[PDB]
Amino acid sequence: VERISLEKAALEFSEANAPHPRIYELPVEEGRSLLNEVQDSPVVKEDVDIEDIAVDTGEWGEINVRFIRPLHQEKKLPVIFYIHGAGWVFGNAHTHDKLIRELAVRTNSVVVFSEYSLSPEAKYPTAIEQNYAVLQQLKDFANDKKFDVNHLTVAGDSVGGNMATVMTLLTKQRGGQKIGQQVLYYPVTDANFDTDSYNEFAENYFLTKEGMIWFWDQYTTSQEERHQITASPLRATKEDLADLPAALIITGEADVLRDEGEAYARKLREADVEVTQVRFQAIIHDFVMVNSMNETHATRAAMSLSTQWINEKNR
Amino acid sequence: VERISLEKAALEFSEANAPHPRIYELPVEEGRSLLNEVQDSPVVKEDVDIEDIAVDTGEWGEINVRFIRPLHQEKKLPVIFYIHGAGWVFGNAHTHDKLIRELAVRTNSVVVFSEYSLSPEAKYPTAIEQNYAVLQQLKDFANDKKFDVNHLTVAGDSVGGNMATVMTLLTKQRGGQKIGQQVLYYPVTDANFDTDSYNEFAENYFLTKEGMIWFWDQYTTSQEERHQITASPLRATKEDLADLPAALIITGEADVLRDEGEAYARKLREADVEVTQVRFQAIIHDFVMVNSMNETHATRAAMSLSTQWINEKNR
Ligand SMILES: [Cl-]
């Protein structure tokens, strides 16, 4: 099979995910299991205290929220609100465990991780409403969980990066809990399947054009919903994006979502938002989450850049 | 006229250098003055101990070699050999002052900065042999200057990056002083003017196609010499590149040199060399050196990544 230059682990993850049936061609409960089994593979995880709290989002129901804290910290820590990815269909505290532990320890922060309702059982805009409601209840936990809600970062990977930047939109529109800055790992920004990266990396790079069409189909099949800026933030006007929190936007070269991530970065920059946009060569979608890609140069450099950038923000 | 999305400081520096005559249309002496003047503009510089030594390169004559040291450091520090850019025609310890002080402090390293002979007065291969000569003498200054030669990083910007990576090939060919790793900021890697980035960014982004044609003409007009892997390292075979030191290669989006930098990273990775390749969006050539670009998101992210990458190496 013909591919561009990739890190060994990215090539191996691409080859391992080429055979049919792929993850998005399984009954959604078997897909969810397969990602869990993928994320059982060997990795060194930083050390944290974990607390699972049921949080009531009101109209949008009760979800588990996981609170993660580095060991032996007496002081009031900054807080990171982390929204997981994996296509609105998969993922949980276990799939993203290595990533959020690394963020907690290297930024010396509490990580708050919403287990939002998954598609297709939950449709747009349930996940974004539940995530926005948890953000409004962070002040309610700030004292018992020893974090400072005035040192607030929102972050997410893929579909989670989509909802993370959408948290900044909803907050500006509804005057909610101030967000200092946002970190989007290889986000979804648009329900369009015709960008040059979508065309070039359509097949053979683990995340496929066909799979992304399916993920959007699980989230909502309404064109009117997909055109809302809280589904496709790439569609935001200059006036919509003005005064949003400072953003770090990380892309990989061999990713269908590369161009829409880089395009969204240019739109924020044109709206005078502070933007740090970096593309890592020779790497595929999902590289800061997947355990087997934990050692890639892209992963090591992405985590060094992201943790440092947040550390600089908090002080 | 019109440019892709750029950071404010990159746009301003592009416009300032739009009108004729440009720096490469001046006599070489006014060229050198213009760049010295540009680097008089105000910027925060870290504090350091500085020391100008004459070093004898044998055949290629005696050159000034600057040692930079972070204040109040009672240990043997790691060392970085830094080869400056600016087209082989310009640059000196003044033009690169801000950058080498930041590298010294944030890596807690001595910075050894060879003031190699400039072109056209000197031709290929003088500058690379002088730089190579100083490398083999580092073990001899190691004690007065308290550094450990077994924690040796070579680094360079643009033609400095060219000559830095060429130091690693000469070292391998000759059994010279072992280099741990190499940092290339937007390197020159090939005497070809026909890459997609050369065409797209040929004009309006400060560094022009015509500018690079002239810089190469000052260095050597010989097509035979340009085909040499010690002039155009992109032309190296897999066998030439095998076992070279671990590489960090940084590129800017809005840079004629972007593609040949990215292409050289692929060739190193295909030769099983450890490569960290990162492209920063919306930034022009020279962004880690030029004082007026010191606060760009690109410059801050490139300094944070490259300094942490070097620190992790020195363990
Ligand atoms: Cl299918």
Contacts of B207 (CB under 8 A, 6+ apart): B201, B255, B256, B257, B284, B285, B286
Q: How close, in Å, is residue A281 to chain B by CA atoms? A: 5
What angle in degrees, to the nearest 10, is found between the helix axes of B97-107 and B297-313?
40
Give the closest of B5, B275, B301 to A297, CB-based.
B275
Of A5, A265, A305, the CB nearest to B269: A5
Cross-chain CB nearest to B277 (options A265, A281, A300)? A281
Distance from C-alpha of B192 to C-alpha of B159, rounded to nearest angstrom? 14
Distance between CA atoms of residues B177 and A211, nearest Å: 51
- Is the CB of A262 inside 8 Å of chain B's CB atoms? yes
Whether residue B276 and residue A269 make contact (CB cut-off 8 A), yes or no, is: no
Using the structure block, give the residue that is written with the tokens 């050196």.
B289
DSSP of B268-299: HHHTT--EEEEEEEEEETTTTT-GGGTTSHHH
Cα A5 to middle of ligand 1, angstroms: 26
Structure tokens that stand for B309 in this block:
């990458």
Give the minimum alpha-carbon distance from A89 to chain B in angstroms, rounded to a whole number: 31
Q: Do B281 and A279 touch (CB under 8 A)?
A: yes
Q: Does B264 touch chain A (CB under 8 A)?
A: no
Question: How close B249 gets to chain A, by Cα (Å)?
Answer: 10
Between CA A72 and CA A274 the distance in angstroms is 34
- Whether the CB of A304 is below 8 Å from some CB of chain B: the reply is yes
Q: B266 touching A, CB under 8 A?
A: yes
Which residue is closest to A261 within chain B, CA to CA?
A: B281
Q: Which chain B residue lies closest to A268 (C-alpha atoms)?
A: B5
Cα B290 to Cα B95: distance, rounded to the nearest angstrom = 8
In terms of Cα–Cα distance, which of A238, A302, A295, A291 is closest to A264? A238
Classify residue B33 as exposed, middle or buried by CB count within 10 Å of its CB (0-12, 13-18, 19+): middle
Beta bridge pairs of residue B153: B80, B181
Distance from CA of A86 to the nearest CA of B (A): 24
Which residues from A are below 8 Å from B298, CB to CB?
A: 276
Buried b (16+ CB within 10 A) or exposed e, B215-249: bbebbbeeeebbebbbbbbbbbeeeebeebbbbbb
Distance A285 CA to ligand 1 centre (A): 19
Q: A282 vs B265: CB contact, 8 Å cut-off?
A: yes
B84 in Cβ contact with B280 (< 8 Å): no
Q: Which residues of chain A does B277 touch, with a Cβ-Cβ cutoff of 8 Å?
A: 280-282, 297
Please give, rounded to a whole number of angstroms, the shortest distance from the CA of B160 to a CA of chain A: 22
Q: Which residues of B are catalytic?
A: 158, 255, 285
In angstroms, what CA-CA distances link B56 with B79, B112, B122, B136, B166?
Answer: 20, 15, 16, 11, 20
Quick check: B278 and A282 CB within 8 A?
Answer: no
Going by C-alpha positions, the residue among A10, A3, A189 that lies closest to residue B277 is: A10
Q: Furthest-apart CA pair in chain A: how many Å?
A: 55
d(CA A287, CA A6): 12
**Which residue on chain B is closest to A252 by alpha carbon?**
B278
Distance A249 CA to ligand 1 centre (A): 30
On whether the CB atoms of residues B125 and B230 are closer than 8 A, the answer is yes
Cβ–Cβ under 8 Å, residues A256 and B256: no
Q: What angle do CA A30, A102, A107 make, to 5 degrees?
A: 140
Q: Within the 193-232 window of chain A, which residues sit less than 8 Å (CB to CB) from chain B?
A: none
Which positions of A are annotated as active-site residues?
A: 158, 255, 285
Interface check A36 vs B, CB under 8 A: no
Residue A97 carries which side chain, given as an amino acid letter? Answer: D
- Are A269 and B7 an interchain contact pair (Cβ–Cβ within 8 Å)? yes
Q: Do B274 and A297 touch (CB under 8 A)?
A: yes
B314 by DSSP, 3-state: which? Answer: coil
B265 vs A contacts (CB less than 8 Å): 281-282
B275 and chain A in contact, CB less than 8 A: yes
Query: Tokens in use for A255?
Result: 């990713």
CB atoms within 10 A of CB B94: 11
Give chain B's largest Cα–Cα span. 55
**How close is the Cα of A210 to the center of ligand 1, in Å?**
7
Q: How far is B62 from chain A (nearest CA, A)?
A: 39
CA distance A187 to A161: 4
Taking the C-alpha atoms of residue A62 and residue A31, their distance in angstroms, rounded to an integer, is: 23
Q: Output b/e per residue, B281-314; b: 16+ Cβ within 10 A.
A: bbbbbbbbbbbbbbebbbbbbbbbbbbbbbeebb
| Residue partners of B106: CB distance under 8 A and separation at least 6 | B46, B303, B307, B311
Instruction: Write the CB contacts of B292 (distance below 8 Å, at least 6 apart in sequence).
Output: B9, B12, B13, B38, B41
Which residues does chain B have within 8 Å of residue A275's beta carbon, measured at their own beta carbons? 281-282, 297
Q: How far apart are CA B11 and CA B142, in angstroms?
A: 43
Residues 106-135 of A with CB under 8 A from B: none
Burial of A225 (0-12, 13-18, 19+ CB in 10 A): middle
A12 at B interface, C-beta within 8 A: no
Residue A141 has φ and ψ, to the nearest 5°, of -105, -10
Name residue A276's beta-bridge partners: A248
Count CA atoms within 13 Å of residue B283 on its CB side. Answer: 32
Asked whether the beta carbons of residue A281 and residue B266 sit closer than 8 angstroms, the reply is yes
> What method was applied to determine this entry?
X-ray
CA of A260 to the centre of ligand 1 (A): 23
Cβ-nearest to A308 among B278, B279, B304 = B304
Pairing state of beta strands B275-284 and B246-254?
A: parallel
Q: Does B265 touch chain A (CB under 8 A)?
A: yes
Instruction: Compute the distance between CA of residue B7 and CA of residue A301 in angstroms, rounded to an integer.
Output: 22
